[PDB]
Ligand binder design. Sequence first.
Ligand code: ADP
Ligand code: F90
Ligand code: MG
Length: 322
Amino acid sequence: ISNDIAIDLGTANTLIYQKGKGIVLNEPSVVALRNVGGRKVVHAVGIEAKQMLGRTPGHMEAIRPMRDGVIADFEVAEEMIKYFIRKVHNRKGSGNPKVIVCVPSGATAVERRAINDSCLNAGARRVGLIDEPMAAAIGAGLPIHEPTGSMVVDIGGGTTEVAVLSLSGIVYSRSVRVGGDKMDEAIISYMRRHHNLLIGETTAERIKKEIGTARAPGLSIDVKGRDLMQGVPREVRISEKQAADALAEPVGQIVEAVKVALEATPPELASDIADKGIMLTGGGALLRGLDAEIRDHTGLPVTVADDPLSCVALGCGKVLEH
Ligand SMILES: Nc1ncnc2c1ncn2[C@@H]1O[C@H](COP(=O)(O)OP(=O)(O)O)[C@@H](O)[C@H]1O
Ligand SMILES: N=C(N)SCc1ccc(Cl)cc1
Ligand SMILES: [Mg+2]
């Protein structure tokens, strides 16, 4: 019975894998703060804090401290990490926990140090950082030990991370700020301009899951929100075609991120990727039809990982057990 853990500290979701157990926590990367006096106190972290997005009283706020793939607020990110690490601690298990945290290719020395220290301050005795695209690839079942290159396209909340891997190493990696959040924001902007309806970010994500698609058909759902000009609540019906229209720009920007990475690939790795194609991971990979859009624009096979939301945690989990 161990307290050793591997953490996927995602822009939108945090997962923890505990040695010998598997994934024991999976909660939004959100912290709610309450203004008391002139200071901010931690009010909630995780599932309850996400529920407060768009619903806070004046003296509270809900923050995603990793929202854009960078640490926006070190103290709030460290409180978020300490909360989750503390939450899964098993008093029956051994002390001196070894903690592995996944780190995106773009993370700075400053951010890596800050994650290291947050884990120490949360009780870790030793901290190891592992490259996130290696984690994604492993959890997606890619044979990353083989010499032939693999390309993984990991579409998260605040970023899409693209990497080419070979012989247990990363050869190329690029990050762009397009992913699940820009898809939500596109649906917000669509509803405003086309239906004069102002919607919250949690509603926008729901619309994306229920009817979002990367290609036109279709079916319809009710969407409720705030009237633009006059401010009273009302509702309108929106279709799959309309959702496709709304998502077309951020979908195109993901496709372009994939093309840019491909265009950097040297000849022998290009031959490797032209064979095996591209593996999609992250929750953004669940967008209906995104795989076909990428296939159509690249000419390459596109596969969606099993369980795309958990690939990174599963992969670093495997590393922790070995
Ligand atoms: N069924 C779905 N369709 C489209 N997008 C989805 C779906 N489920 C989750 N997502 C999106 O996936 C993103 C979360 O992906 P995730 O890999 O957890 O990101 P991160 O690792 O940065 O936290 C969010 O934008 C979420 O809305
Ligand atoms: N995990 C992501 N893809 S974004 C958050 C993050 C986590 C760790 C560091 Cl060092 C920087 C950013
Ligand atoms: Mg991620």
